[PDB]
Design a protein around this ligand. Sequence first.
Ligand code: GDP
Length: 169
Amino acid sequence: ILFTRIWRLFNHQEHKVIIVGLDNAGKTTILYQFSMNEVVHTSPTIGSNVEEIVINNTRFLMWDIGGQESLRSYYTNTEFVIVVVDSTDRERISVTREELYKMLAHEDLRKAGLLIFANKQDVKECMTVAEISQFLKLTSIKDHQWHIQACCALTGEGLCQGLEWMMSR
Ligand SMILES: Nc1nc2c(ncn2[C@@H]2O[C@H](COP(=O)(O)OP(=O)(O)O)[C@@H](O)[C@H]2O)c(=O)[nH]1
C-alpha cells in the first residue's frame, strides 16, 4: 500500500521515463512491480528496438543496451533515466558504464535525473552498491541529479525508495 500511494501520487503529472540496461538486468521485472493494479499499454516503435510501456500517466521507454545496440547511437523531454544494473554480472558491467556515458553526453538529456537500480542484490556475493557507484564513477557526474538504489525486482524491495528519490525531484 505504501509503494502504491507514492506511485499514484507520483502520477499526478505525466512523466517521461527511460529505462535502460543489458538484457536480463531486470528491467521488465521492475516495470511489472510498477504495474500491479494499474492500467498498462505497451507498444513497439518504428525504426528502433524501443518498447513503450505506459503505466497510468508514466510513459516508460525501454530497451536493452549492448550487442548491436552498441553500434548505434527520444532523449528530449525525458525527466528520468533509469539504468538497471545486474549486481552479479561483473563481466559485462563495463558495457553498461560505456553506454551510460554515451547517453549523458547527448544534450537532450541535460535535464534528465539519473537513477541507478543496483538489481539482484538478493544474490549472494553480488557487487555492493558502493562498488557499482564507484565503478560507474557516479560522483564524477556533476551536471545531473543522481541516486543509486539497491533493489530486488522479484520482491520489489528498494523500488519504492528509488521512486521517492524520483518524486522528490
Ligand atoms: N534473483 C533475482 N532475479 C531477478 C531479479 N530481477 C529480475 N530477475 C530475474 O532475471 C531474469 C531477467 O529479468 P528481466 O526482467 O526479464 O530482464 P530484462 O531483459 O532486463 O527485461 C528474470 O528471469 C527474472 O526472474 C532480482 O532482483 N533477483
